[PDB]
Amino acid sequence: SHMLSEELRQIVFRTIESLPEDLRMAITLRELDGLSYEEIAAIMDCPVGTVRSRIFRAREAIDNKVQPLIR
DNA sequence: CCCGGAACTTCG
DNA sequence: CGAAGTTCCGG
């Protein structure tokens, strides 16, 4: 309820939620399901290299919403 | 603009 | 070394 640390966790969830389906799924399978890149690539039927960038780019989007928040 | 993937780099 | 993570040349 409005304390900074609380604003930050909500910002993380909210940003994951608004990501493009592929980025959201790739970051979700990695962070919440704890899957390996290999596994995620099978689930998403795509090259693992695409999993690498998708996860990278999903992380970037989360960080661009979080960094403007700390100190 | 929004990323796809593979090369390249770091980490466990 | 194998998995995770970073970068870049496209398309």
mmCIF file with all atom_site columns, C-alpha atoms (C1' of nucleotides) in Angstrom:
data_model
loop_
_atom_site.group_PDB
_atom_site.id
_atom_site.type_symbol
_atom_site.label_atom_id
_atom_site.label_alt_id
_atom_site.label_comp_id
_atom_site.label_asym_id
_atom_site.label_entity_id
_atom_site.label_seq_id
_atom_site.pdbx_PDB_ins_code
_atom_site.Cartn_x
_atom_site.Cartn_y
_atom_site.Cartn_z
_atom_site.occupancy
_atom_site.B_iso_or_equiv
_atom_site.pdbx_formal_charge
_atom_site.auth_seq_id
_atom_site.auth_comp_id
_atom_site.auth_asym_id
_atom_site.auth_atom_id
_atom_site.pdbx_PDB_model_num
ATOM 1  C CA    . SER A 1 1  ? 0.000  0.000   0.000   1.00 0.00 ? 1  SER A CA    1
ATOM 2  C CA    . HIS A 1 2  ? 2.271  2.806   -1.429  1.00 0.00 ? 2  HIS A CA    1
ATOM 3  C CA    . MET A 1 3  ? 5.604  2.027   0.351   1.00 0.00 ? 3  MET A CA    1
ATOM 4  C CA    . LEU A 1 4  ? 8.475  2.059   -2.184  1.00 0.00 ? 4  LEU A CA    1
ATOM 5  C CA    . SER A 1 5  ? 9.479  -1.599  -1.950  1.00 0.00 ? 5  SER A CA    1
ATOM 6  C CA    . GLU A 1 6  ? 5.833  -2.411  -2.572  1.00 0.00 ? 6  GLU A CA    1
ATOM 7  C CA    . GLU A 1 7  ? 5.645  -0.092  -5.600  1.00 0.00 ? 7  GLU A CA    1
ATOM 8  C CA    . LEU A 1 8  ? 8.629  -1.978  -6.996  1.00 0.00 ? 8  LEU A CA    1
ATOM 9  C CA    . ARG A 1 9  ? 7.221  -5.479  -6.808  1.00 0.00 ? 9  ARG A CA    1
ATOM 10 C CA    . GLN A 1 10 ? 3.958  -4.344  -8.367  1.00 0.00 ? 10 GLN A CA    1
ATOM 11 C CA    . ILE A 1 11 ? 5.900  -2.605  -11.131 1.00 0.00 ? 11 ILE A CA    1
ATOM 12 C CA    . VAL A 1 12 ? 7.635  -5.900  -11.892 1.00 0.00 ? 12 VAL A CA    1
ATOM 13 C CA    . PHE A 1 13 ? 4.381  -7.875  -12.173 1.00 0.00 ? 13 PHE A CA    1
ATOM 14 C CA    . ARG A 1 14 ? 2.635  -5.122  -14.112 1.00 0.00 ? 14 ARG A CA    1
ATOM 15 C CA    . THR A 1 15 ? 5.457  -4.881  -16.642 1.00 0.00 ? 15 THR A CA    1
ATOM 16 C CA    . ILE A 1 16 ? 5.658  -8.627  -17.173 1.00 0.00 ? 16 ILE A CA    1
ATOM 17 C CA    . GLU A 1 17 ? 1.915  -8.529  -17.730 1.00 0.00 ? 17 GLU A CA    1
ATOM 18 C CA    . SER A 1 18 ? 2.109  -5.884  -20.501 1.00 0.00 ? 18 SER A CA    1
ATOM 19 C CA    . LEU A 1 19 ? 4.946  -7.533  -22.398 1.00 0.00 ? 19 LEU A CA    1
ATOM 20 C CA    . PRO A 1 20 ? 4.401  -9.044  -25.875 1.00 0.00 ? 20 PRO A CA    1
ATOM 21 C CA    . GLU A 1 21 ? 3.213  -12.662 -25.512 1.00 0.00 ? 21 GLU A CA    1
ATOM 22 C CA    . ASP A 1 22 ? 6.432  -14.169 -26.645 1.00 0.00 ? 22 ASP A CA    1
ATOM 23 C CA    . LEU A 1 23 ? 8.601  -12.046 -24.199 1.00 0.00 ? 23 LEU A CA    1
ATOM 24 C CA    . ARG A 1 24 ? 6.139  -12.526 -21.335 1.00 0.00 ? 24 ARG A CA    1
ATOM 25 C CA    . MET A 1 25 ? 6.069  -16.320 -21.789 1.00 0.00 ? 25 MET A CA    1
ATOM 26 C CA    . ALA A 1 26 ? 9.824  -16.608 -22.194 1.00 0.00 ? 26 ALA A CA    1
ATOM 27 C CA    . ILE A 1 27 ? 10.518 -14.606 -19.008 1.00 0.00 ? 27 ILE A CA    1
ATOM 28 C CA    . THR A 1 28 ? 7.687  -16.341 -17.121 1.00 0.00 ? 28 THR A CA    1
ATOM 29 C CA    . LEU A 1 29 ? 8.856  -19.874 -17.970 1.00 0.00 ? 29 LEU A CA    1
ATOM 30 C CA    . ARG A 1 30 ? 12.376 -18.932 -16.929 1.00 0.00 ? 30 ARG A CA    1
ATOM 31 C CA    . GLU A 1 31 ? 11.693 -16.976 -13.732 1.00 0.00 ? 31 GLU A CA    1
ATOM 32 C CA    . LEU A 1 32 ? 8.536  -18.562 -12.338 1.00 0.00 ? 32 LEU A CA    1
ATOM 33 C CA    . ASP A 1 33 ? 8.786  -22.099 -13.697 1.00 0.00 ? 33 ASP A CA    1
ATOM 34 C CA    . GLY A 1 34 ? 12.554 -22.152 -13.358 1.00 0.00 ? 34 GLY A CA    1
ATOM 35 C CA    . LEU A 1 35 ? 13.075 -23.782 -16.764 1.00 0.00 ? 35 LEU A CA    1
ATOM 36 C CA    . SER A 1 36 ? 16.359 -23.954 -18.670 1.00 0.00 ? 36 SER A CA    1
ATOM 37 C CA    . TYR A 1 37 ? 16.820 -22.172 -22.007 1.00 0.00 ? 37 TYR A CA    1
ATOM 38 C CA    . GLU A 1 38 ? 16.843 -25.593 -23.737 1.00 0.00 ? 38 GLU A CA    1
ATOM 39 C CA    . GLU A 1 39 ? 13.481 -26.481 -22.182 1.00 0.00 ? 39 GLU A CA    1
ATOM 40 C CA    . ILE A 1 40 ? 11.912 -23.112 -22.883 1.00 0.00 ? 40 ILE A CA    1
ATOM 41 C CA    . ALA A 1 41 ? 12.951 -23.416 -26.532 1.00 0.00 ? 41 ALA A CA    1
ATOM 42 C CA    . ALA A 1 42 ? 11.171 -26.773 -26.752 1.00 0.00 ? 42 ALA A CA    1
ATOM 43 C CA    . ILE A 1 43 ? 8.044  -25.394 -25.105 1.00 0.00 ? 43 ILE A CA    1
ATOM 44 C CA    . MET A 1 44 ? 8.067  -22.364 -27.401 1.00 0.00 ? 44 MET A CA    1
ATOM 45 C CA    . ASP A 1 45 ? 9.280  -24.345 -30.423 1.00 0.00 ? 45 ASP A CA    1
ATOM 46 C CA    . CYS A 1 46 ? 11.906 -21.755 -31.344 1.00 0.00 ? 46 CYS A CA    1
ATOM 47 C CA    . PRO A 1 47 ? 15.716 -21.587 -31.462 1.00 0.00 ? 47 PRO A CA    1
ATOM 48 C CA    . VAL A 1 48 ? 17.393 -21.255 -28.106 1.00 0.00 ? 48 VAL A CA    1
ATOM 49 C CA    . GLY A 1 49 ? 19.041 -18.108 -29.441 1.00 0.00 ? 49 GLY A CA    1
ATOM 50 C CA    . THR A 1 50 ? 15.596 -16.560 -29.656 1.00 0.00 ? 50 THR A CA    1
ATOM 51 C CA    . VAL A 1 51 ? 14.992 -17.555 -26.052 1.00 0.00 ? 51 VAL A CA    1
ATOM 52 C CA    . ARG A 1 52 ? 18.231 -15.800 -25.125 1.00 0.00 ? 52 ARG A CA    1
ATOM 53 C CA    . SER A 1 53 ? 17.248 -12.455 -26.678 1.00 0.00 ? 53 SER A CA    1
ATOM 54 C CA    . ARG A 1 54 ? 13.597 -12.662 -25.653 1.00 0.00 ? 54 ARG A CA    1
ATOM 55 C CA    . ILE A 1 55 ? 14.575 -13.182 -22.030 1.00 0.00 ? 55 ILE A CA    1
ATOM 56 C CA    . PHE A 1 56 ? 17.191 -10.427 -22.343 1.00 0.00 ? 56 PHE A CA    1
ATOM 57 C CA    . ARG A 1 57 ? 14.707 -8.032  -23.866 1.00 0.00 ? 57 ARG A CA    1
ATOM 58 C CA    . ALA A 1 58 ? 11.973 -8.877  -21.330 1.00 0.00 ? 58 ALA A CA    1
ATOM 59 C CA    . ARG A 1 59 ? 14.496 -8.164  -18.547 1.00 0.00 ? 59 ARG A CA    1
ATOM 60 C CA    . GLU A 1 60 ? 15.438 -4.872  -20.200 1.00 0.00 ? 60 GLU A CA    1
ATOM 61 C CA    . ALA A 1 61 ? 11.768 -3.792  -20.256 1.00 0.00 ? 61 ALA A CA    1
ATOM 62 C CA    . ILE A 1 62 ? 11.396 -4.636  -16.571 1.00 0.00 ? 62 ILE A CA    1
ATOM 63 C CA    . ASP A 1 63 ? 14.572 -2.770  -15.676 1.00 0.00 ? 63 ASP A CA    1
ATOM 64 C CA    . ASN A 1 64 ? 13.582 0.366   -17.621 1.00 0.00 ? 64 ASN A CA    1
ATOM 65 C CA    . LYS A 1 65 ? 10.509 0.584   -15.382 1.00 0.00 ? 65 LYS A CA    1
ATOM 66 C CA    . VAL A 1 66 ? 12.396 -0.182  -12.193 1.00 0.00 ? 66 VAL A CA    1
ATOM 67 C CA    . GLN A 1 67 ? 15.623 1.837   -12.409 1.00 0.00 ? 67 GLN A CA    1
ATOM 68 C CA    . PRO A 1 68 ? 13.837 5.196   -12.568 1.00 0.00 ? 68 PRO A CA    1
ATOM 69 C CA    . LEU A 1 69 ? 12.617 4.184   -9.125  1.00 0.00 ? 69 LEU A CA    1
ATOM 70 C CA    . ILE A 1 70 ? 15.612 3.488   -6.918  1.00 0.00 ? 70 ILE A CA    1
ATOM 71 C CA    . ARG A 1 71 ? 17.574 6.327   -5.430  1.00 0.00 ? 71 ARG A CA    1
ATOM 72 C "C1'" . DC  B 2 1  ? 10.364 0.026   -34.410 1.00 0.00 ? 1  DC  B "C1'" 1
ATOM 73 C "C1'" . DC  B 2 2  ? 10.474 -4.557  -32.815 1.00 0.00 ? 2  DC  B "C1'" 1
ATOM 74 C "C1'" . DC  B 2 3  ? 12.715 -7.998  -32.460 1.00 0.00 ? 3  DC  B "C1'" 1
ATOM 75 C "C1'" . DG  B 2 4  ? 15.038 -13.116 -34.876 1.00 0.00 ? 4  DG  B "C1'" 1
ATOM 76 C "C1'" . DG  B 2 5  ? 18.735 -15.776 -34.164 1.00 0.00 ? 5  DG  B "C1'" 1
ATOM 77 C "C1'" . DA  B 2 6  ? 23.458 -16.949 -34.102 1.00 0.00 ? 6  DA  B "C1'" 1
ATOM 78 C "C1'" . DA  B 2 7  ? 28.216 -15.389 -32.569 1.00 0.00 ? 7  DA  B "C1'" 1
ATOM 79 C "C1'" . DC  B 2 8  ? 30.458 -14.239 -28.654 1.00 0.00 ? 8  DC  B "C1'" 1
ATOM 80 C "C1'" . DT  B 2 9  ? 31.250 -13.838 -23.427 1.00 0.00 ? 9  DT  B "C1'" 1
ATOM 81 C "C1'" . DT  B 2 10 ? 30.571 -14.835 -18.704 1.00 0.00 ? 10 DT  B "C1'" 1
ATOM 82 C "C1'" . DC  B 2 11 ? 29.293 -17.849 -14.928 1.00 0.00 ? 11 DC  B "C1'" 1
ATOM 83 C "C1'" . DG  B 2 12 ? 28.718 -22.049 -12.049 1.00 0.00 ? 12 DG  B "C1'" 1
ATOM 84 C "C1'" . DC  C 3 1  ? 32.589 -27.583 -20.142 1.00 0.00 ? 1  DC  C "C1'" 1
ATOM 85 C "C1'" . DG  C 3 2  ? 27.713 -26.768 -20.390 1.00 0.00 ? 2  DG  C "C1'" 1
ATOM 86 C "C1'" . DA  C 3 3  ? 24.161 -23.270 -19.169 1.00 0.00 ? 3  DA  C "C1'" 1
ATOM 87 C "C1'" . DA  C 3 4  ? 23.185 -18.580 -18.737 1.00 0.00 ? 4  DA  C "C1'" 1
ATOM 88 C "C1'" . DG  C 3 5  ? 23.645 -14.112 -20.348 1.00 0.00 ? 5  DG  C "C1'" 1
ATOM 89 C "C1'" . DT  C 3 6  ? 25.145 -10.118 -23.918 1.00 0.00 ? 6  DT  C "C1'" 1
ATOM 90 C "C1'" . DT  C 3 7  ? 25.686 -8.345  -28.228 1.00 0.00 ? 7  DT  C "C1'" 1
ATOM 91 C "C1'" . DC  C 3 8  ? 24.909 -7.346  -33.019 1.00 0.00 ? 8  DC  C "C1'" 1
ATOM 92 C "C1'" . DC  C 3 9  ? 23.664 -7.732  -37.968 1.00 0.00 ? 9  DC  C "C1'" 1
ATOM 93 C "C1'" . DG  C 3 10 ? 20.258 -7.749  -40.015 1.00 0.00 ? 10 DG  C "C1'" 1
ATOM 94 C "C1'" . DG  C 3 11 ? 14.803 -8.094  -41.862 1.00 0.00 ? 11 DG  C "C1'" 1
#
